């Protein structure tokens, strides 16, 4: 399923395969496109192409008149026309389908993404004033200004938003189960041993969260409740990494545990998006301009670079909340990942 | 700040808060005030107060052979004096301010407005046509007739003109144009914006993204704000007229994707002394503004009789033979509310 942007002015029509490009582990998904240009008004007018990977965290013309703009994370530029010595050597078979489908003038293009780029992730707006807009995106544009590839303007450019979505690795980490014992000032015993034992380490948008919670008990302050609450860390880094807590979903029955025994239940949740639609500040995976997106996958930080990764650093965790008489809201958190 | 009206018999006076009332939407702005009458002419004569919402479309001692008069879409009546076992159950804080300042005589009065009623808006006359008019107005009358509640005249009737002025997605039209002497898309034209409800004080950028106006040279792109001056007396009636429009020579190229923002400011004092552009309701000599857009509530039983103003940025291009193609949108100008 191939798609085009016929550039507004019928000069530089850009034909591409896919708008979601895969963020692989060993590699990235590179671009493989062509650009049909017409030879009549493009006479000694030199076509190029770019990929402008860009962060967005605000208004256009307002953040224009400040001191900074956006910190474009990356920009690739390659010379389509006229071809420095005809540089398509390994053509794609989509670049082999288009060149024979279209007219002889079609000019290929191909971008290989580096290893230091975060993905396309967008903060969720709210119901209200919901446009201090944030989000990374990958965008790809054809252009031709008189001045050389280091200068351009808008009257030729063909812009087509794509994405790069992170994807989880090959091995999950060891079975995590770790939390508090909670000693007090007025009731003495070990008083709520709890085990939120789990089963896996890296989930996706296909499977739920079973949490095997194991009370161990000899009570002298009655328990009354265990809610379990999946919590997002919407960890934004502009000046600072920024933890913004809010629960994507949480569930509970009212199972009671008695004094002096050990209880156990598998509580379980699914974080949906349609339930978290029309809500504020819930990091979602990047959107293709109005197309449906999903809950943000876990972003992760590489094992030692020089420069702090700037952006929103989404984490997740089942917080196992308990309600105890006369109403103390006891809880604790762990690690787990939705990459 | 407060204002009153006194009769030439200084019999009935009316003290109020604000001639501009906010036509809210869940609610409206109810009228609040007091009537101040005198003792001894008003012995055994009964004072009342009314709100007259009216539709006006012509001349005073002329347009009364319309089979009718100003067809008063709504008229409200409440019993000022003798107060009638008085239900000012909520008396107002400004009526509280008026009752102790003035004598404890002050007869409070209050008006609920229903939902099927329009705002105050008029057609601007010509510079040459003298004896003509049109428009809505909301006025108040405080009076007393030796009668039953039905009979009513002047000289005790004190009349104050007040107002009931109303205090999307990023909306974008991108259209093609197919011809008889061209093949290409030949004009996609995207008028992208960032606001759909403006006021007096925030200008009009129209980000017009041109998409191939070639094979037929373009002269250029006019952008022109048109008020829709709808009027529904016997028939609904729009009267097209541009309030403002501005204009540079930026010249889109064959095989080059242009985009320009054109910056419009519809001002009143530039459209002062003109013809056919609704202004906001005004008070007897004082300065007013360009009319706010009115809206038609979702699902009334009976259609609204009034002037129903809207606006729109028409983007009229002009292409080589000077053939001026265009396209419009919806775009609505309500007030900002205190």
């Amino acid at each position: 399923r191939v798609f085009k942007k016929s550039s507004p002015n019928c000069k530089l029509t850009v034909y591409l395969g896919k708008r979601d490009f895969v963020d692989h582990l060993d590699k990235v998904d590179p671009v493989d496109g062509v650009v049909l240009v017409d030879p009549d008004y493009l006479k000694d007018r030199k076509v190029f192409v770019t990929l402008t990977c860009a962060f967005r965290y605000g208004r256009e013309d307002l953040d224009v008149l400040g001191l900074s703009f956006r910190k474009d994370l990356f920009i690739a530029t390659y010379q389509a026309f006229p071809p420095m010595p005809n540089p398509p050597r390994p053509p794609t078979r989509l670049q082999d389908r288009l060149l024979k489908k279209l007219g002889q003038h079609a000019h290929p293009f191909f971008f290989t993404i580096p290893q230091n780029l975060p993905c396309s992730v967008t903060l969720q707006p709210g119901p209200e004033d919901t446009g201090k807009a944030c989000g990374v995106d990958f965008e790809i544009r054809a252009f031709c200004a008189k001045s050389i590839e280091e200068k351009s303007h808008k009257r030729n450019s063909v812009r087509l938003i794509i994405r790069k979505v992170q994807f989880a690795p090959e091995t999950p980490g060891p079975q995590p189960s770790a939390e508090t014992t909670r000693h007090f000032l007025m009731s003495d015993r070990r008083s709520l041993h709890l085990e939120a034992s789990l089963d896996k380490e890296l989930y996706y948008h296909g499977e739920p969260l079973n949490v095997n919670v194991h009370v161990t008990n000899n009570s002298a302050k009655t328990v009354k409740k265990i809610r379990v609450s999946v919590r997002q860390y919407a960890d934004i880094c502009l000046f600072s990494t920024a933890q913004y807590k809010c629960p994507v979903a949480q569930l509970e029955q009212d199972d009671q545990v008695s004094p002096s025994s050990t209880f156990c239940k598998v509580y379980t949740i699914t974080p949906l998006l349609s339930d978290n639609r029309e809500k504020r500040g819930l990091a979602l995976d990047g959107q293709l301009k109005h197309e449906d997106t999903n809950l943000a996958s876990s972003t992760i930080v590489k094992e030692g670079a020089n420069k702090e990764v700037l952006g929103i650093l989404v984490s997740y965790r089942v917080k196992v909340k308990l309600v105890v008489s006369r109403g103390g809201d006891v809880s604790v958190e762990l690690p787990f990942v939705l990459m | 700040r407060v204002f009153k009206k006194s009769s030439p018999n200084c019999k009935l006076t009316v003290y109020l808060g604000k001639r501009d009332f906010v036509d809210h939407l869940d609610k409206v702005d109810p009228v609040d005030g007091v009537v101040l009458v005198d003792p001894d002419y008003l012995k055994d004569r009964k004072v009342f107060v009314t709100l007259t919402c009216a539709f006006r479309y012509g001349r005073e001692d002329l347009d009364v052979l319309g089979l009718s008069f100003r067809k008063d879409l709504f008229i409200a009546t409440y019993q000022a004096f003798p107060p009638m076992p008085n239900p000012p159950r909520p008396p107002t804080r400004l009526q509280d301010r008026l009752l102790k300042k003035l004598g404890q005589h002050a007869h409070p009065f209050f008006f609920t407005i229903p939902q099927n009623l329009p705002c105050s808006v008029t057609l601007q006359p010509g510079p040459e046509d003298t004896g003509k008019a049109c428009g809505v107005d909301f006025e108040i009358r405080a009076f007393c007739a030796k009668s039953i509640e039905e009979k009513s005249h002047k000289r005790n009737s004190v009349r104050l003109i007040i107002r009931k002025v109303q205090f999307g997605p990023q909306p974008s039209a991108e259209t093609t144009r197919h011809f008889l002497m061209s093949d290409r898309r030949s004009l996609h034209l995207e008028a992208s914006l960032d606001k759909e409800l403006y006021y007096h004080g925030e200008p009009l950028n129209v980000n017009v993204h041109v998409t191939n106006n070639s094979a037929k040279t373009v002269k250029k792109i006019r952008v022109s704000v048109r008020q829709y001056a709808d009027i529904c007396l016997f028939s609904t009636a729009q009267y097209k007229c541009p309030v403002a429009q501005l204009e540079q020579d930026d010249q889109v190229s064959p095989s080059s994707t242009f985009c320009k923002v054109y910056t419009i400011t519809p001002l009143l004092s530039d459209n002062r002394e003109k013809r056919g552009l609704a202004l906001d309701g005004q008070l007897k000599h004082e300065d007013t503004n360009l009319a706010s857009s009115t809206i038609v509530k979702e699902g009334a039983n009976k259609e609204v009789l009034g002037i129903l103003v809207s606006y729109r940025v028409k983007v009229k291009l002009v292409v080589s033979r000077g053939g001026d193609v265009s396209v419009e949108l919806p775009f609505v100008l309500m007030h900002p509310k205190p």
Binding site: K4, K5, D63, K154, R159 | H209
Partner: peptide, 12 residues
């Protein structure tokens, strides 16, 4: 400050 939009193409 660097640059701006057109604002929409959704598919082919």
């Amino acid at each position: 400050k660097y640059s701006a939009k057109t604002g929409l193409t959704k598919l082919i």
